[PDB]
Design a protein around this ligand. Sequence first.
Ligand code: ADP
Ligand code: ADP
Ligand code: ADP
Ligand code: ADP
Lengths: 96, 13, 427, 411, 435, 440, 55, 49
Amino acid sequence: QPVASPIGPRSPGPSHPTFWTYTEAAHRAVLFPQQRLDQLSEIIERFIFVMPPVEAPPPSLHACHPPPWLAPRQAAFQEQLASELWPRARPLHRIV
Amino acid sequence: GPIITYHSVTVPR
Amino acid sequence: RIERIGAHSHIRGLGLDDALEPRQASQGMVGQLAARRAAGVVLEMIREGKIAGRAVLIAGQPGTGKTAIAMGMAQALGPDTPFTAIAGSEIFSLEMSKTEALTQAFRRSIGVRIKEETEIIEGEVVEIQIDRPSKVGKLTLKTTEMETIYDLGTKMIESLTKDKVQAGDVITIDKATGKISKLGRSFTRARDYDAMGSQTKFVQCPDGELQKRKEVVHTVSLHEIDVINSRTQGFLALFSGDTGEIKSEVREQINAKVAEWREEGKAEIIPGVLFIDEVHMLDIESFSFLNRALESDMAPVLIMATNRGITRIRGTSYQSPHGIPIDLLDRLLIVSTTPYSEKDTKQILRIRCEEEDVEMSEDAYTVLTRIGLETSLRYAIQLITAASLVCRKRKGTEVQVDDIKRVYSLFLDESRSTQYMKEYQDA
Amino acid sequence: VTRIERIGAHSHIRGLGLDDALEPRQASQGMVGQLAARRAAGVVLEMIREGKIAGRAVLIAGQPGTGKTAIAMGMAQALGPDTPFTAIAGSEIFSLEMSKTEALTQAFRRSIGVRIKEETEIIEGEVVEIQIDRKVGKLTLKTTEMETIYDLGTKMIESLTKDKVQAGDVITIDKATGKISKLGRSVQCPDGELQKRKEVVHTVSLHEIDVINSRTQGFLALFSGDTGEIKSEVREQINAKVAEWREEGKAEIIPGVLFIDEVHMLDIESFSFLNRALESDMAPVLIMATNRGITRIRGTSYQSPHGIPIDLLDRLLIVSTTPYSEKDTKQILRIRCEEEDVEMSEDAYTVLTRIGLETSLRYAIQLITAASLVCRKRKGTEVQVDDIKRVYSLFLDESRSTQYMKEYQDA
Amino acid sequence: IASHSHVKGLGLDESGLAKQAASGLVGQENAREACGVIVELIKSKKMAGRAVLLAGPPGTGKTALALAIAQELGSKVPFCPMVGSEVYSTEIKKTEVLMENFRRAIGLRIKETKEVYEGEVTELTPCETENKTISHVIIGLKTAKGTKQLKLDPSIFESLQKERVEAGDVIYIEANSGAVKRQGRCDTYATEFDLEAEEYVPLPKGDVHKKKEIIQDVTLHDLDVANARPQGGQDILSMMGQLMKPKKTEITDKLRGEINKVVNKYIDQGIAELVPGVLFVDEVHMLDIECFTYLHRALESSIAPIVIFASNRGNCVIRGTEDITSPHGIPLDLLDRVMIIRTMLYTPQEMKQIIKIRAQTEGINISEEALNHLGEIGTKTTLRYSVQLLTPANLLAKINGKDSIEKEHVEEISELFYDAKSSAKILADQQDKYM
Amino acid sequence: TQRIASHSHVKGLGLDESGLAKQAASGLVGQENAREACGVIVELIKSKKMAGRAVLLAGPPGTGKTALALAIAQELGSKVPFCPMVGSEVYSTEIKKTEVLMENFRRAIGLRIKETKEVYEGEVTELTPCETENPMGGYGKTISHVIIGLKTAKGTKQLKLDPSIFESLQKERVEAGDVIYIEANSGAVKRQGRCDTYATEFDLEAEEYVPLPKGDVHKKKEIIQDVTLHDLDVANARPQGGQDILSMMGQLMKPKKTEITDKLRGEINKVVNKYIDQGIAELVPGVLFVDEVHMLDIECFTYLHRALESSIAPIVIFASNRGNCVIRGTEDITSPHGIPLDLLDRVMIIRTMLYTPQEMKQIIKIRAQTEGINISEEALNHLGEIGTKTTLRYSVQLLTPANLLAKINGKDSIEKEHVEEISELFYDAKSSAKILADQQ
Amino acid sequence: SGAVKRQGRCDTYYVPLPKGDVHKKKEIIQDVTLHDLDVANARPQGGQDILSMMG
Amino acid sequence: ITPGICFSTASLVLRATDVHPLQRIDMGRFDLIGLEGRVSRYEADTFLP
Ligand SMILES: Nc1ncnc2c1ncn2[C@@H]1O[C@H](COP(=O)(O)OP(=O)(O)O)[C@@H](O)[C@H]1O
Ligand SMILES: Nc1ncnc2c1ncn2[C@@H]1O[C@H](COP(=O)(O)OP(=O)(O)O)[C@@H](O)[C@H]1O
Ligand SMILES: Nc1ncnc2c1ncn2[C@@H]1O[C@H](COP(=O)(O)OP(=O)(O)O)[C@@H](O)[C@H]1O
Ligand SMILES: Nc1ncnc2c1ncn2[C@@H]1O[C@H](COP(=O)(O)OP(=O)(O)O)[C@@H](O)[C@H]1O
């Protein structure tokens, strides 16, 4: 998955080159978004203060006489998205 | 029952 | 450690006195007394910093030390004061407008410094006892003056275990937030090596008091503030320059809140400098926006380098001096840099060859000053490095006149290149 | 006190002042003079109401400021609601998210309405009591004339528990979907029957239909997320399905109006696209205005009348407007003063008419309010000639500011 | 703070007549007494789409009067300053930028009541039920005044879980928006340990549940953006961060529709009041013919606010057309829909008083001789240059040790810093040496 | 083996130790005055200091410019970074030109990093404790170390680890008889899986089955990576992290690919300077080759001679084939080489001379030797003759089709008739232009 | 294909009860364009993974 | 927080205009994009034949 990144891919062990061909000192040179949030947490607490002038509830409901099979699919889709991605959005809760 | 204790002493430096 | 010596690495600051009187060849700069004195006056007004949005235009011949004076001002201004260097062609972006790029460049040289008095605890951990049944334990912190004990709480133990701090370790604990930071290993941090250990970098234990109250400072630019406040992606400052902050409450709110902070004494201001090199690249729209962007109270000072003279303005067919419309030229204070004389060119070459560690003979200096007075000072300067290599190749000690002559015959300047372009040369 | 819509340059225009036989009155419904163009616009308005003919374009030309946009606003106000009238400036098509041709066809589709009718049983009454047994529950609804119990399904009882379970809320229950909407703490309670069968009529445009049926969460018509609708399946299939709704008792199409103001901004590409967009059966009727004479078409050096190519000018009808005289100018100024809260004397009206005939008409219309506010400063009641002169001196105009340029500025 | 810190009003008498020297302005009596009519028209809240054009050479106080109009209007109305170059956006339509500027140039003050739950939480029990997800959550909020057990939504429970709260801490809850903050653990638990990674906050006072009213102010553009790029909650709409995330390219269907409908519904029921402001568009001469033409309908619309353009050119070629010229670089089509206001070119006497005012505003003790020499400097150069020379003279005086600016200080400053015309002459003399 | 390119014959500048040029060494013939000129900048590059320099190889089209410009890279060796980029690669649709230029600038700069790590491997045999008295009140005896037996193809050895490592083992959930990897500097433990010596007969559990752990149970070997600064730039700009939804946006093409100076200065440069002063990485300043630089516009040139003055930039080698031409991006501004005078006065110029009949003949001989063609002495002379009329490119391109015609006519060496027939079957620029002018 | 679609609940408890042969068998001679085939393969249609974000 | 959610009041018959069970073709026999990540080369080239 890492094609040209300076950090090596997952290596099952030292039995082949991809383990001995990459350095941890270079791996430390790249900071993931998690480490970026960690190091910016000191200023995120004090410099994020912009409140939006107006806040809107969920984008838009739909007044309709719709086919009964419409809302169930959208509900299932939203539930799947909430079960998949929402757990990953925990770090951004601080900025939110 | 399963009380664990993690310790780290400074032996005499 | 290894950051090579660029073209402007020889100047360490304006060679001025306490009364802003430029010296002949002090602090790297040579000659150019009038322009250096003007640079010093504007630098003093900068270090004062109670007037915002002032523009200066350093015009002059090519290769007379305009960018040199700019780098000298930057160095004399040093850190703790934003100095943003930008070429006129850098604002022509594809994902953001020219006016937005100029607003970014301005707000990037305005610093906001929050000073906080968060107290901490600094000492060398002696023991970290903890019993899991919520787990509870104790810690023994030692400094060269005293020792103390602390009862560790649940989240305290959690953070200590996550950071994996052990005995003999020197650490700092932010009591307000509980943030742990291990600074190193004390001599006691010796693990009684009998296993797979590969670290023995010891350091003296912390001195002074156990629970001291030190002062922290967080300095971030208005640019960073609005960037991190734009959207939930608070990493665009490093992630990528994808931007376009609407001028809605976001920026106006940054400004209003920084005003309240300055009023209440949280963080007041630290103005900055924007060195626009080759400003003739800016468009008529850029100039028209700057006209009023210089009028904002959050506007840092700007210094624009100019080589052009009476030439058309980019984006139109209006002939104007400096390639800038008089509309913007009126706000500026113009400083003209004069060409260097023989003794000024010679001294510049001497300082440059002494900075790049190349010993030239007395006749080498003479022939190089001749070449630099007949041709460009930049060509004369670039000749030094090339001439030193032939000397090193022949195992010499100091560059002679024959090496400089060989290099002159080997490499061509623009004039001799043009005079050699006698054929079609695929015009 | 003050609403969003306030007094404007065309607020006095309430519609076309025509008779039953499309004959314009001297001064009626805020429209003065311009008899020829007004009766020529009444004809296109009538055949628009008819709608049997598709793809008609009527251009209006003349001297700048001769009620060119006033006639269009009057046509809009006469057509009234329930009939789309999309007014767009010649620049609104130049966009970055959509091509110019795409924006023009988007406006063409917005200028076409589709009428649909349906019946739905709606409830409206005051909540009395609620019960939920963790799931099914019961509800008690009340109106000023009757009360009733209901055994609610899981979703309904959940939607009601979402609110304050105790009495007080006056809710509405769309039995089709069941979306609850509490009007307030029982705003008074409703009268008549609790549940009534209501007729619902909707005039949904073809562009809205496309945006709805183009994507999941398709209703991107609130932020212009309709980037390049796929004509291959979306628009062709929508046209077919609208033709199927037609002639079956389901729906009927209501052709709208498209007012392209300052069409000289459009380019040869937009004109070439119109050449065929005005030939489709779903093509709406449009009107267009222009202030330039024989000028260059944007895109090439071709000098054409109205800045519109000949192959398209032959595809439309042209109506010329005559310059206003003293009578028409004075009457227009009087109508403007009646629309506003200002009142002028007869000599003041005469002086303002002379000033609006010397330089231009809009100048006097603008000086009206300035003279009113200046007379209100000296603690007067009526706008006088001295106040109008004070204003004529304070505020300059095009022709008197272009002549004061005896001192050179930037260029 | 310079270049606008001296102007704080038009300085007009009770009769609307321009005073000789007051409110930081001198001269320009006609222009100021005319802009008085403009400020009165804006405060009347009766008209819409009116436009003014402050026309004059560079440095004749047109922008000064533009900001004085805002200072007179006060901070209660939205004053939107804009540069003509801002229309050239790379993310939204050129006309979209202008229409959203017009929309934000209009204000709206609205009084709203909002409820809040707060107090030291005693316990948080999630009432479970089979669907098999959590049904409700009972939270026991204690306060110095009282205590209440309250049932909240699973969404609020999930927000608390994100906050990583525990029983016995202090939380601030809001039912309107749904956001919950963790103020820290109750001060009564600070004695539990010697040190903890916990913020401590005392027991909240007052009632556990409290409704408070706030008179906020927002522009129509604020509602437009809130409805175009919605964030809300209760959903996973956070995908906004990757959906498109440019400037939303708003659409008329909802700009002129739902928003106007809902704001009129709020206004006609005594909840909100319309507060039309001012749209000051400085440097209007670099606007494209497309923008100039859209300005026709913008000003002829019944909702556009009072606009104020600034003209600095006499007669040049119009932008976007490349072949046609008109006065002020604006087409005669738009120039006929504006009320032009001259900005007279300043005389030596007025320029001297302007320099004096600027010096006294920049905290500078300039002597009379230096002031009078600046008179000659300004009569030979531009007013802006002569006034800019002030501060360097103060720095040079501080360096020399004098408590006031003398002739020699301003002479040195003028000799060090050249002017536009002097630099142009130097360039003309060195023509074939500046490239 | 690989394809034979147009410059596969050049291997070096062929210069004497005293700095003089040889006759035909390293595949390059003649061109002494320019080969020495560029050998000087080769030594400049070797001298890692004195950076921020630019040299412009100017001359008629195709004389020796690209040949010697990329032979500079062969003289320098693959060790130092040499980034080539034609002037047409600056125009991009997702990122700005001044940003492509900055990327290429600090992409040509290399940074090699060394690191030594100890590694363990071997099928574990058994784990046991090291009991000891209670450090505190008599609640029970404690453990000081854990003995673990690791067996490899060489031998079986016992090792002592700390209780923290045993807790890591417990939370890793390995058992006795599996393959583990251990490190002392870091302390992390990796579970490779079951060994092949215990291979199953049927079981389908796929875990990248670990073969017999050949080698010692403890092995130390130095890793030496070659990472560039642009690699760090792109990695910190779009990190390929884990479940950090900010990173989960990898499903997008992600336009708006520009960097930021704040980061570029405060984040990436500090970590490199620290490594350099600590002794973990050695900076390898490099070369940035820009052929057809005349394609750049006025904005690109203005940014180029602002970046070249930076103390961090690498050494640049521009190439120019044009004469007195108009500068692209401007309406009508004629300057030498299509490059503005302001940039020309900042770079050293090297005129690539034109070749004579004998020199072109030697070049044709070298190209035929490189392409494996057995050209005869008569065909070589005829090629020289017909190449003195036209350019060298056309003269030397008539070697593959001539050899094909020879092989088809049953030959093993290009004869005179073969090249005579190919010269009539194909034409050159001037011959084609003559027919074009004769025709309408 | 197995594309089960829930029309709603029967009117006896809403949509009327279908009135015909439960086993609907008929030939669809509907025409399609050659560009619809490319449009259908340009983007994948499905879900159950992060691919759902592609909709 | 604007309580007036601008819910779309569009008509009812337009919620789904493309759904037609007996008036659509089996595009499944032309689905090539769905094969790349589910079907194997050995499946179609060697096994099925
Ligand atoms: N007064 C001076 N003292 C020392 N070096 C100078 C001086 N003026 C110019 N130089 C040198 O000349 C070289 C090129 O001149 P530069 O400062 O770039 O002028 P310009 O910006 O007009 O080209 C620089 O490397 C600089 O070090
Ligand atoms: N016949 C008329 N009756 C009433 N008002 C008019 C009439 N003709 C023009 N006006 C008013 O005078 C002004 C003329 O400007 P307008 O005709 O809109 O210019 P243009 O149409 O060229 O943009 C408008 O504000 C319009 O309201
Ligand atoms: N009436 C005035 N009184 C005092 N200072 C003035 C006056 N008019 C102009 N100035 C000064 O002139 C400077 C430039 O004027 P400005 O308003 O920019 O003119 P313009 O808007 O035509 O460019 C301002 O900084 C201001 O200090
Ligand atoms: N001195 C030389 N020795 C051998 N071959 C040469 C020499 N000079 C040029 N050539 C050949 O000429 C061909 C074209 O040269 P090139 O680098 O493309 O110059 P340009 O780019 O100006 O056309 C190359 O393939 C190279 O093999």
